[PDB]
């Protein structure tokens, strides 16, 4: 009677490698390896995906409505919030139907900040009456930093509605003891790269 010390590492290594091959082919709803200077757009999407229900799920980005558009001028007098409006038509072009979408992620690049600013997030409802989404406590930093807000239900509601322009609000926390606090945090692409939605959707081809 002698308990063996360790299992042979190369055997379990190829066992895990074959199981990983099976996992990769099973995530993509595939059974065979498909065959056929790739552009920089997928580089941008992949690099955005890296930094921060079984099967593999399509990812696609839709960008901000540009700042020069005539939709932000209605609320430009407000200087304590950043207004992020997204074209629902491009979202529906990326995600043709609601139920296959599973996760929506909003990204915000901060070029440089030096203050303790506690931010919030809202959406339109087109009444100019906003719902609460989620806050984020931002510490000063010397490097660009991205942010992530859970807006899955937001984009699910946007897909259940007609194509148009519905968007977000990036408002500073304003407690009832200190009202009208100015937003001291800066978001790239708004204040003198731009924010975008990151959509985790089940692909239309496989489901």
């Amino acid at each position, epitope marked *: 009677l002698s308990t063996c010390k360790t299992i042979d590492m190369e055997l379990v290594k190829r066992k895990r490698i074959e199981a990983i091959r099976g996992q990769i082919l099973s995530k993509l709803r595939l059974a065979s390896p498909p065959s056929q200077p790739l552009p920089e757009a997928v580089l941008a999407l992949y690099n955005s995906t890296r930094d921060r229900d079984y099967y593999a799920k399509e990812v696609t980005r839709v960008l901000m409505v540009d700042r020069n558009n005539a939709i932000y001028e209605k609320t430009k007098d407000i200087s304590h919030s950043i207004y992020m409006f997204f074209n629902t*038509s491009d979202i529906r072009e990326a995600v*043709p*139907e609601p139920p296959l979408l599973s996760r929506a992620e909003l990204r915000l690049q901060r070029l440089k900040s030096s203050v303790e600013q506690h931010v919030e997030l809202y959406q339109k409802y087109s*009444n100019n009456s906003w719902r609460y989404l989620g806050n984020r406590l931002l510490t000063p930093t010397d490097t660009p930093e991205w942010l992530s807000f859970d807006v899955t239900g937001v984009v699910r509601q946007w897909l259940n509605q007609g*194509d*148009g*322009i519905q968007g977000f609000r990036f408002s500073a926390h304003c407690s009832c003891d200190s009202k009208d606090n100015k937003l001291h945090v800066e978001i790239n692409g708004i204040s003198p790269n731009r924010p975008f939605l990151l959509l985790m959707a089940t692909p239309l081809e496989r489901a």
Partner: antibody
Amino acid sequence: VQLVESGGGLVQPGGSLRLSCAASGFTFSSYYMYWVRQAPGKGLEWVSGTSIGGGSTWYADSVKGRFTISRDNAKNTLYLQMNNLKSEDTAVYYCAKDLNSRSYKGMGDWGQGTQVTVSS
Amino acid sequence: ALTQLSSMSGSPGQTVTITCTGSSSNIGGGYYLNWYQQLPGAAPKLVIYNANNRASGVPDRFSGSKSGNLASLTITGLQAEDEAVYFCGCYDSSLSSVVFGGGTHLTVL
């Protein structure tokens, strides 16, 4: 582009019926689809709408539950299942396309419409 | 829902405007507002989508307007073929439905 329809005829109150909308000239499994009715002497009124594939379907508030929509993307046809008809359903139910492919924004090419009525 | 006049008369050769006013959920929500003409004994036809753009097969005589809660369609010169009921259609996010307005019977002469 044309959208012929079928499934009219008089229906007894409280009954059921189904309408079909054959579509041609465009990629049917790439567009949202809408049902719009119009009673004679009264304006247009939205009835139902479905996504690309039928996963998400929307119905008007006044007609929710009674009507059910579905798609058959292989045969380029789409159905509207009437259930429990009542007296304000006497209308011509038009079947309509959408402007762009992956979009829910408006009604593009329409159909000829078929007349569905309920009476004694 | 969508406030639109019921009857609007006129004469050939003028420039008259069909109005369409809502409640900031349909017109003011930024959604695509459409313009449908219903010829007598015919199906509704797409004319102006998003209140700016002209549909295919439609002459440049038609033009739409979009301002706040007010959206309208203008025709420069009325002929016999324009004698139709006009509907403004836009998605409403208050009722969560694509509600139409009460069409106006455009009568020429």
